[PDB]
Motif scaffolding. Structure first.
Motif, PDB file in Angstrom:
ATOM      1  N   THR A  26       0.832  -1.210   0.000  1.00 33.36           N
ATOM      2  CA  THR A  26       0.000   0.000   0.000  1.00 33.36           C
ATOM      3  C   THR A  26       0.871   1.267   0.000  1.00 33.36           C
ATOM      4  O   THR A  26       0.588   2.209  -0.742  1.00 33.36           O
ATOM      5  N   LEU A  49       2.770   1.554  -3.379  1.00 30.88           N
ATOM      6  CA  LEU A  49       1.847   2.117  -4.373  1.00 30.88           C
ATOM      7  C   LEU A  49       1.599   3.633  -4.178  1.00 30.88           C
ATOM      8  O   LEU A  49       1.680   4.400  -5.141  1.00 30.88           O
ATOM      9  N   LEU A  56     -13.997   6.791   9.092  1.00 29.27           N
ATOM     10  CA  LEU A  56     -12.821   6.170   9.703  1.00 29.27           C
ATOM     11  C   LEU A  56     -12.925   6.053  11.227  1.00 29.27           C
ATOM     12  O   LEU A  56     -13.119   7.069  11.917  1.00 29.27           O
ATOM     13  N   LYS A  77      -8.810   2.118  12.068  1.00 30.88           N
ATOM     14  CA  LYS A  77      -8.460   2.463  10.690  1.00 30.88           C
ATOM     15  C   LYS A  77      -7.536   3.668  10.604  1.00 30.88           C
ATOM     16  O   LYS A  77      -6.572   3.638   9.847  1.00 30.88           O
ATOM     17  N   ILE A 117      -3.787   3.810   8.998  1.00 26.60           N
ATOM     18  CA  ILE A 117      -3.396   4.850   8.052  1.00 26.60           C
ATOM     19  C   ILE A 117      -2.167   5.625   8.582  1.00 26.60           C
ATOM     20  O   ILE A 117      -1.237   5.884   7.808  1.00 26.60           O
ATOM     21  N   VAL A 149      -6.903   5.268  -1.594  1.00 23.41           N
ATOM     22  CA  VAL A 149      -6.171   4.102  -2.088  1.00 23.41           C
ATOM     23  C   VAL A 149      -6.853   2.845  -1.545  1.00 23.41           C
ATOM     24  O   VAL A 149      -7.074   1.914  -2.306  1.00 23.41           O
ATOM     25  N   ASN A 150      -7.247   2.841  -0.254  1.00 25.13           N
ATOM     26  CA  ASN A 150      -8.002   1.699   0.304  1.00 25.13           C
ATOM     27  C   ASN A 150      -9.340   1.463  -0.417  1.00 25.13           C
ATOM     28  O   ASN A 150      -9.713   0.317  -0.681  1.00 25.13           O
ATOM     29  N   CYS A 151     -10.046   2.553  -0.726  1.00 22.31           N
ATOM     30  CA  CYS A 151     -11.355   2.551  -1.369  1.00 22.31           C
ATOM     31  C   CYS A 151     -11.272   2.227  -2.845  1.00 22.31           C
ATOM     32  O   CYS A 151     -12.222   1.663  -3.385  1.00 22.31           O
ATOM     33  N   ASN A 152     -10.178   2.629  -3.520  1.00 19.54           N
ATOM     34  CA  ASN A 152     -10.137   2.512  -4.967  1.00 19.54           C
ATOM     35  C   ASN A 152      -9.032   1.641  -5.587  1.00 19.54           C
ATOM     36  O   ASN A 152      -9.093   1.388  -6.798  1.00 19.54           O
ATOM     37  N   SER A 173      -0.182  -4.552  -7.090  1.00 14.92           N
ATOM     38  CA  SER A 173      -1.229  -3.591  -6.762  1.00 14.92           C
ATOM     39  C   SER A 173      -1.176  -2.419  -7.722  1.00 14.92           C
ATOM     40  O   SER A 173      -0.100  -2.071  -8.215  1.00 14.92           O
ATOM     41  N   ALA A 219     -12.208   2.178 -11.287  1.00 10.19           N
ATOM     42  CA  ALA A 219     -12.706   2.476  -9.934  1.00 10.19           C
ATOM     43  C   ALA A 219     -14.042   3.231  -9.952  1.00 10.19           C
ATOM     44  O   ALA A 219     -14.685   3.308  -8.924  1.00 10.19           O
ATOM     45  N   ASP A 240     -16.933  -3.232   6.131  1.00 10.11           N
ATOM     46  CA  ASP A 240     -15.611  -3.056   6.706  1.00 10.11           C
ATOM     47  C   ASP A 240     -14.602  -2.433   5.743  1.00 10.11           C
ATOM     48  O   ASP A 240     -13.933  -1.473   6.120  1.00 10.11           O
ATOM     49  N   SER A 241     -14.486  -2.961   4.526  1.00  8.30           N
ATOM     50  CA  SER A 241     -13.492  -2.431   3.583  1.00  8.30           C
ATOM     51  C   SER A 241     -13.992  -1.274   2.711  1.00  8.30           C
ATOM     52  O   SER A 241     -13.167  -0.465   2.269  1.00  8.30           O
ATOM     53  N   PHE A 294     -17.294   0.525   3.347  1.00 10.42           N
ATOM     54  CA  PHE A 294     -18.226   1.400   4.062  1.00 10.42           C
ATOM     55  C   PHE A 294     -19.646   1.469   3.493  1.00 10.42           C
ATOM     56  O   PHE A 294     -20.305   2.504   3.600  1.00 10.42           O
TER      57      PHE A 294
HETATM   58  O1  6TM Z   1      -8.477  -5.676  -5.926  1.00 13.05           O
HETATM   59  C1  6TM Z   1      -8.987  -5.832  -4.822  1.00 13.05           C
HETATM   60  N1  6TM Z   1     -10.261  -6.156  -4.595  1.00 13.05           N
HETATM   61  C2  6TM Z   1     -11.201  -6.262  -5.685  1.00 13.05           C
HETATM   62  C3  6TM Z   1     -12.063  -5.027  -5.785  1.00 13.05           C
HETATM   63  C4  6TM Z   1     -11.245  -3.758  -5.868  1.00 13.05           C
HETATM   64  N2  6TM Z   1     -12.070  -2.606  -6.273  1.00 13.05           N
HETATM   65  C5  6TM Z   1     -11.266  -1.416  -6.623  1.00 13.05           C
HETATM   66  C6  6TM Z   1     -12.297  -0.336  -6.736  1.00 13.05           C
HETATM   67  C7  6TM Z   1     -13.401  -0.750  -5.780  1.00 13.05           C
HETATM   68  C8  6TM Z   1     -13.066  -2.135  -5.275  1.00 13.05           C
HETATM   69  C9  6TM Z   1      -8.148  -5.581  -3.639  1.00 13.05           C
HETATM   70  C10 6TM Z   1      -7.391  -4.397  -3.635  1.00 13.05           C
HETATM   71  C11 6TM Z   1      -6.552  -4.138  -2.460  1.00 13.05           C
HETATM   72  C12 6TM Z   1      -5.715  -2.934  -2.338  1.00 13.05           C
HETATM   73  C13 6TM Z   1      -5.044  -2.515  -3.470  1.00 13.05           C
HETATM   74  C14 6TM Z   1      -4.251  -1.398  -3.461  1.00 13.05           C
HETATM   75  C15 6TM Z   1      -4.070  -0.703  -2.290  1.00 13.05           C
HETATM   76  C16 6TM Z   1      -4.715  -1.093  -1.127  1.00 13.05           C
HETATM   77  C17 6TM Z   1      -5.534  -2.220  -1.137  1.00 13.05           C
HETATM   78  N3  6TM Z   1      -6.210  -2.656   0.048  1.00 13.05           N
HETATM   79  C18 6TM Z   1      -7.593  -2.225   0.126  1.00 13.05           C
HETATM   80  C19 6TM Z   1      -8.315  -2.989   1.214  1.00 13.05           C
HETATM   81  N4  6TM Z   1      -7.675  -2.802   2.523  1.00 13.05           N
HETATM   82  C20 6TM Z   1      -8.373  -3.615   3.562  1.00 13.05           C
HETATM   83  C21 6TM Z   1      -8.509  -2.996   4.947  1.00 13.05           C
HETATM   84  C22 6TM Z   1      -8.825  -1.536   5.001  1.00 13.05           C
HETATM   85  C23 6TM Z   1      -9.976  -1.026   4.427  1.00 13.05           C
HETATM   86  C24 6TM Z   1     -10.287   0.317   4.498  1.00 13.05           C
HETATM   87  C25 6TM Z   1      -9.464   1.157   5.219  1.00 13.05           C
HETATM   88 CL1  6TM Z   1      -9.816   2.847   5.304  1.00 13.05          CL
HETATM   89  C26 6TM Z   1      -8.319   0.655   5.803  1.00 13.05           C
HETATM   90 CL2  6TM Z   1      -7.243   1.683   6.671  1.00 13.05          CL
HETATM   91  C27 6TM Z   1      -8.009  -0.681   5.709  1.00 13.05           C
HETATM   92  C28 6TM Z   1      -6.257  -3.180   2.436  1.00 13.05           C
HETATM   93  C29 6TM Z   1      -5.501  -2.452   1.319  1.00 13.05           C
HETATM   94  N5  6TM Z   1      -6.504  -5.013  -1.406  1.00 13.05           N
HETATM   95  C30 6TM Z   1      -7.255  -6.105  -1.502  1.00 13.05           C
HETATM   96  N6  6TM Z   1      -7.346  -7.079  -0.581  1.00 13.05           N
HETATM   97  N7  6TM Z   1      -8.220  -8.065  -1.009  1.00 13.05           N
HETATM   98  C31 6TM Z   1      -8.655  -7.670  -2.206  1.00 13.05           C
HETATM   99  C32 6TM Z   1      -8.071  -6.440  -2.553  1.00 13.05           C
END
Ligand code: 6TM
Ligand code: SAM
Ligand code: ZN
Ligand code: ZN
Ligand code: ZN
Length: 429
Positions: A101, A104, A137, A141, A145, A175-178, A192, A199, A252-253, A255
Motif C-alpha cells: 500500500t 503504491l 474512519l 483504521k 493509516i 487508495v483503500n477505497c479505490n 497492486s 474504480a 468493513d473495507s 463502508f
Molecule cells: O483488488 C482488490 N479487490 C477487488 C475489488 C477492488 N475494487 C477497486 C475499486 C473498488 C473495489 C483488492 C485491492 C486491495 C488494495 C489494493 C491497493 C491498495 C490497497 C488495497 N487494500 C484495500 C483494502 N484494505 C483492507 C482494509 C482496510 C480497508 C479500508 C481502510 Cl480505510 C483501511 Cl485503513 C483498511 C487493504 C488495502 N486489497 C485487496 N485485498 N483483497 C482484495 C483487494
C-alpha cells in the motif's frame, strides 16, 4: 470520456458508470492503463517490473539487484518509478520493508509530481476526485493509516515532497477505497495498482462485468447482457460466502451495505450454508454455533499461516472440517474454505496428489455457488487441469483445461495470452 459509456449519479451509490449502447456477454466495454502500479516483492524475478510480462531470463537491475526487466527499454521506462526504491533498498538493506500500500501510494505521489494533468487512465474519474470515506474512519483504521503515513515518510522522503498529514490520511483512505490487486490466471497475487476509470464502477453481488489484466492493462468485459441506461456493476469481493459475510466485508473495507438482487432475495444462502440431513436434524442454535466456530477458524488459520508449519496448517484444516462435518454438508462454503486452504498448503508442499484430491471436492460446489462466469471457478478448473496434466492424467487434464478456457474466453477475451498458454499446454501433453 469512453465510447458507449458515461459517468452518472447513481442514486444511493454516488457516481457510477452507465451504458449508452448494448453490450453482449464477452464484449470488451473498455480498457484502462495503470495510473500507478507495483509488482509484489515475491514476484520479483518472475515478471518484468515495467510491463508485468511473465518470462524466463529477465535482466536484473545492476544497482539494487532486486528489479527485473524484459530488456534495457523496460528498465529505462520504469526508472522514474524504480528510482523511489533502487538506492533505498540497498541503503536500508534488511530494514527495507514498506507495505505494498505504501509502495503504491509513493508512486501515486511521484506520478502527481511528474504528470499533474489528467492522464489517459482518468477519462471519467480522476485520482484527486476519489471517494475516501474520511468521515467514516474509526480509531482502528486511522491508526492503520497513521502507520502507513509513518512508513511513507520513513522510506520515501528522498524524491517526494509530502503534503500535510490530513492530505495523506485522505490519500491513503482513497487508495483503500479505490486500489486494485492484480492476480494471474490462477488468482495468485502479482501486484497492486490504480485504475481510475475502472474504480468508477459500483458493486453488485450479481455483476454484469468482470475485470481482468493483460500485463498492467485492466480490461472490462460483460458477463451478462448490458442494455442502454443500465448501470455497469463489478464485484468487489469473493462471492462464495452468504449475504451476511459479504456485507460484513463490504461494510468493513468499502463502508456500504449492498442491496443487489442476491443480498435482497438471499437465494443462494440456504445451499451455501447447507446442513447435514440426518435423524434428529441439528437445532437452529447448533447451526448458529457452528457458523460462529467456522468464521473463527477462518480468522485463526489466516493468522496461523504466517508462523505455523505446513503440517500444523493442514492439521487445522482437517480438524475444523471434522468438527464442522457433524452439522455441515461438504458443499457448505465453510467446509469449502478449509478445503481450499488445505489445497494451497499441498500446492506449496508440491504434494500434487494431495492438492488434486482437495480440488476434486471443491469444483462442483464452486460452480453451484459462484455466478455463471467466475474467475474463481475458471482458476479452480485451471489448477485441476494442470494437476491432472502434471500427474500424467491427460484426458481428465484436457477436459479441465477446456472448462477453464470456456469461462476465460468470456472474461479475459478469446485472444488473451493466458488462453494461448493453456492451449500450448494442451498441445504439448
Ligand atoms: O483488488 C482488490 N479487490 C477487488 C475489488 C477492488 N475494487 C477497486 C475499486 C473498488 C473495489 C483488492 C485491492 C486491495 C488494495 C489494493 C491497493 C491498495 C490497497 C488495497 N487494500 C484495500 C483494502 N484494505 C483492507 C482494509 C482496510 C480497508 C479500508 C481502510 Cl480505510 C483501511 Cl485503513 C483498511 C487493504 C488495502 N486489497 C485487496 N485485498 N483483497 C482484495 C483487494
Ligand atoms: C471504488 S468507489 C466506486 C465509485 C464511487 N461510487 C464514487 O462515486 O467514487 C467504491 C465506493 O462506492 C460506493 N459503492 C459502490 N458500490 C455500491 C453499492 N452497490 N451500494 C452503495 N454504495 C456503493 C461505496 O461508497 C464504496 O466505498
Ligand atoms: Zn517488460
Ligand atoms: Zn535498482
Ligand atoms: Zn449484493
Amino acid at each position: 470520456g469512453l465510447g458507449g459509456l458515461e459517468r452518472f449519479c447513481s442514486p444511493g451509490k454516488g457516481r457510477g458508470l452507465r451504458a449508452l449502447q448494448p453490450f453482449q456477454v464477452g464484449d470488451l466495454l473498455f480498457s484502462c492503463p495503470a495510473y500507478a502500479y507495483v509488482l509484489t516483492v515475491n514476484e520479483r524475478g518472475n515478471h518484468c517490473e515495467y510491463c508485468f510480462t511473465r518470462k524466463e531470463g529477465l535482466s536484473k537491475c545492476g544497482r539494487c539487484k532486486q528489479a527485473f526487466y524484459c530488456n534495457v527499454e523496460c528498465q529505462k521506462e520504469d526508472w522514474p518509478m524504480h528510482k523511489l526504491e533502487c538506492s533505498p533498498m540497498v541503503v536500508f538493506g534488511e530494514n527495507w520493508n514498506p507495505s505494498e500500500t505504501v509502495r503504491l501510494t509513493a508512486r501515486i505521489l511521484a506520478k502527481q509530481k511528474i504528470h499533474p494533468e489528467r492522464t489517459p487512465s482518468e477519462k471519467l474519474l480522476a485520482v484527486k476526485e476519489f471517494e475516501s470515506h474520511l468521515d467514516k474512519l474509526d480509531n482502528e483504521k486511522k491508526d492503520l493509516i497513521q502507520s502507513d503515513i509513518a512508513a511513507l515518510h520513513h522510506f520515501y522522503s528522498k524524491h517526494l515532497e509530502f503534503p500535510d498529514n490530513d492530505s495523506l490520511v485522505v490519500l491513503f483512505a482513497q487508495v483503500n477505497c479505490n486500489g486494485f490487486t492484480i492476480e494471474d490466471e490462477e488468482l495468485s497475487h502479482l501486484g497492486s495498482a490504480i485504475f481510475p476509470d475502472v474504480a468508477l464502477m459500483n458493486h453488485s453481488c450479481c455483476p454484469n462485468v468482470i475485470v481482468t489484466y493483460k500485463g498492467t492493462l485492466a480490461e472490462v468485459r460483460a458477463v451478462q447482457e448490458i442494455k442502454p441506461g443500465e448501470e455497469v456493476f463489478t464485484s468487489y469481493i469473493d462471492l462464495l460466502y452468504p449475504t451476511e459475510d459479504r456485507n460484513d466485508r463490504l461494510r468493513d473495507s468499502y463502508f456500504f451495505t449492498c442491496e443487489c438482487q442476491e443480498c435482497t432475495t438471499k437465494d443462494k444462502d440456504k445451499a451455501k450454508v447447507e446442513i447435514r440431513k440426518l435423524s434428529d436434524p441439528p437445532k437452529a442454535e447448533a447451526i448458529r454455533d457452528m457458523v460462529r466456530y467456522a468464521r473463527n477458524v477462518i480468522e485463526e488459520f489466516r493468522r496461523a499461516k504466517h508462523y505455523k508449519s505446513p503440517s500444523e496448517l493442514l492439521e487445522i484444516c482437517e480438524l475444523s472440517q471434522e468438527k464442522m462435518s457433524s452439522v455441515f454438508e461438504d458443499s457448505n462454503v465453510y467446509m469449502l474454505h478449509m478445503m481450499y486452504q488445505a489445497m494451497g498448503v499441498c500446492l506449496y508442499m508440491q504434494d500434487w496428489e494431495g492438492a488434486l484430491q482437495y480440488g476434486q471436492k471443491i469444483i462442483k460446489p464452486y460452480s453451484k455457488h459462484y455466478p455463471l462466469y467466475s474467475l474463481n471457478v475458471a482458476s479452480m478448473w485451471l489448477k485441476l487441469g494442470r494437476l491432472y496434466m502434471g500427474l500424467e492424467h491427460k484426458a481428465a487434464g484436457e477436459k479441465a483445461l477446456k472448462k477453464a478456457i470456456a469461462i476465460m474466453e468470456v472474461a479475459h477475451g478469446k485472444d488473451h495470452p493466458y488462453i494461448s498458454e493453456i492451449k500450448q499446454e494442451i498441445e504439448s501433453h
